[PDB]
Design a protein around this ligand. Structure first.
Ligand SMILES: Cc1cc2nc3c(=O)[nH]c(=O)nc-3n(C[C@H](O)[C@H](O)[C@H](O)COP(=O)(O)OP(=O)(O)OC[C@H]3O[C@@H](n4cnc5c(N)ncnc54)[C@H](O)[C@@H]3O)c2cc1C
Ligand SMILES: Cc1cc2nc3c(=O)[nH]c(=O)nc-3n(C[C@H](O)[C@H](O)[C@H](O)COP(=O)(O)OP(=O)(O)OC[C@H]3O[C@@H](n4cnc5c(N)ncnc54)[C@H](O)[C@@H]3O)c2cc1C
Lengths: 193, 191
C-alpha cells in the first residue's frame, strides 16, 4: 500500500494529441488504486506550484513518468517540470552532488536525499522497438533505458531507484489501444501487485 | 567559409548564471569569424520565430549548441527550442523517420544530410563521473549521456563533430583554460 505520484506529460501539439498518455495515465490511476495504492496525478504541461510539487515528491513512494517520446526524449514541458521542481527540491530531494572532502569515497550523484523512493517510466513512441535493440540501428542497440539514460540519472541524482520501464511502440502507424492498455495493466500488476 | 549558427543555451535561474555560456558563445563567435566563417548567434531563451529559426538551419552548414548541463541534459528552454523548431522544420529539415520500403530504418528520413552539429557543454560534474566505468554514468562518456540530444540532430540527417565540454565549472572554475581549450578545439575542426 504505497503513495504513487503520476506525472502525466501529455501534450497536444503537432501530431501529438496527448490522448494516449491521458488514457494510460487513467489506466495507471485505476489499476493502481485497485491494487490498494493511493494515487496523485499532476500534468507537467500546467501551471503547477513548484513548492507543492516538491511536497508531492516527499509524499510519493513511487514516481511514474507517463510521457510521449518527443525528439528522442521528454517533452520540454516535462523537462521544465524537472528543472523547476527538482531544483526547488534542494534541501528536501537532494543535498548536493555528494562529493565531499570529508569522504573521498563519495562520487558525483551520491548527494540525494530520497533514497528508497522509486520511479518508473511509461513511454509512448512512434519508433519501433527494433530501433532500440538492433545493434546496427539508430540507437546503436543501447536500448530504451539507454536512450533515457540522462532522464534516469536526473531521478537517481535524487537517490531514487528505477522500476522496469514500460513503453508502447509504433503508436501512430500501428496504433493498438486496447493491447497497450492491457499490457500496461499487466505490467503494473507484476510490479505493484 | 562556412555558415555557423551558434545556439546559446545560457539561462540564469537558481545557481546557474549564464555568464560562462555567454562567454563561451562569444569565444566561438570571435574565433570562427576570425577564421573567415559567417556566424549567427541565437539565444534559445528568447522570443524566437520558428519559421525564422528553420531558415537559420537551412542557411547554416554547422550548428553549435553552447549550453550548460541541466539535470543531465539540455535546459528545458533548449529542448523547447528543438520541439518548436525541429517540428516546424517538417518538410525542410526532415521528411519522416525514414520508414516507408523494408530496408530504411528509423531515423533515416532526414532532409539536411551534409550539415553538421557540435555540442559545447558546461557541467558542475567532473569528467571522471562520465568515464569511470563504476561512477554515476557507467562509463558511457559525455556523448553517451547526450545520446538522445545527438540523435535529435541526427534525425534531420545532420552529422556530429567532436564534443567540447568544461567540467567542475562551479567548484573549480577555470576561465581561461576553458577558453584556450575551446579556442584550440574550434581551430582544429574549423581551421
Ligand atoms: C514535437 C514532437 C516530437 C516527436 N518526436 C518523436 C521522436 O523523437 N520519436 C518518436 O518515436 N516519436 C516522436 N513523436 C511522436 C509522439 O511520440 C507521438 O505522437 C505520441 O507519443 C503519441 O502520444 P499522445 O499521447 O500524443 O497520443 P495521440 O496523439 O492521441 O496518438 C495516439 C494514437 O492513438 C489513438 N488513441 C489515443 N487514445 C486512444 C483511446 N483512448 N482509444 C483509442 N485510440 C486512442 C489516436 O487516435 C492516435 O492515432 C514526436 C511528436 C511531437 C509532437
Ligand atoms: C536547474 C539546474 C540544473 C543543473 N543540473 C546539473 C547537472 O545535472 N549536472 C551538472 O554537472 N551541473 C548541473 N547544473 C550546474 C550548471 O551546469 C552550471 O551552473 C552551469 O553550466 C554554469 O554555466 P553558466 O553559464 O550558468 O555560468 P556561471 O553560473 O556564471 O558559472 C560559471 C563560473 O564561472 C565564472 N565565470 C563565468 N564567466 C566568467 C568569465 N567571463 N570570466 C571569469 N569567470 C567567469 C562564474 O563566476 C562562475 O563561478 C545545474 C544548474 C541548474 C541551475
Amino acid at each position: 500500500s504505497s503513495n504513487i505520484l503520476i506525472i502525466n506529460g501529455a501534450k497536444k501539439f503537432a501530431h501529438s494529441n496527448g490522448q494516449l498518455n491521458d488514457t494510460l495515465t487513467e489506466v495507471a490511476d485505476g489499476t493502481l488504486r485497485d491494487l490498494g495504492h493511493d494515487v496523485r496525478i499532476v500534468r507537467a504541461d500546467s501551471d503547477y506550484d513548484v513548492k507543492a510539487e516538491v511536497q508531492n515528491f516527499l509524499w510519493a513512494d513511487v514516481v511514474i513518468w507517463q510521457m510521449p517520446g518527443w525528439w528522442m526524449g521528454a517533452p520540454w514541458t516535462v523537462k521544465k517540470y524537472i528543472d523547476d521542481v527538482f531544483t526547488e527540491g534542494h534541501g528536501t530531494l537532494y543535498a548536493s552532488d555528494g562529493r565531499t572532502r570529508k569522504d573521498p569515497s563519495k562520487k558525483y550523484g551520491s548527494g540525494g536525499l530520497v533514497q528508497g523512493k522509486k520511479y518508473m517510466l511509461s513511454l509512448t513512441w512512434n519508433a519501433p522497438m527494433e530501433a532500440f535493440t538492433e545493434k546496427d540501428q539508430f540507437f546503436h542497440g543501447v536500448g530504451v533505458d539507454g536512450v533515457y539514460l540522462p532522464f534516469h540519472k536526473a531521478n537517481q541524482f535524487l537517490g531514487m531507484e528505477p522500476l522496469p520501464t514500460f513503453i508502447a511502440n509504433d503508436v501512430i502507424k500501428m496504433p493498438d489501444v486496447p493491447r497497450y492498455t492491457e499490457e500496461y495493466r499487466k505490467h503494473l500488476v507484476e510490479i505493484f501487485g
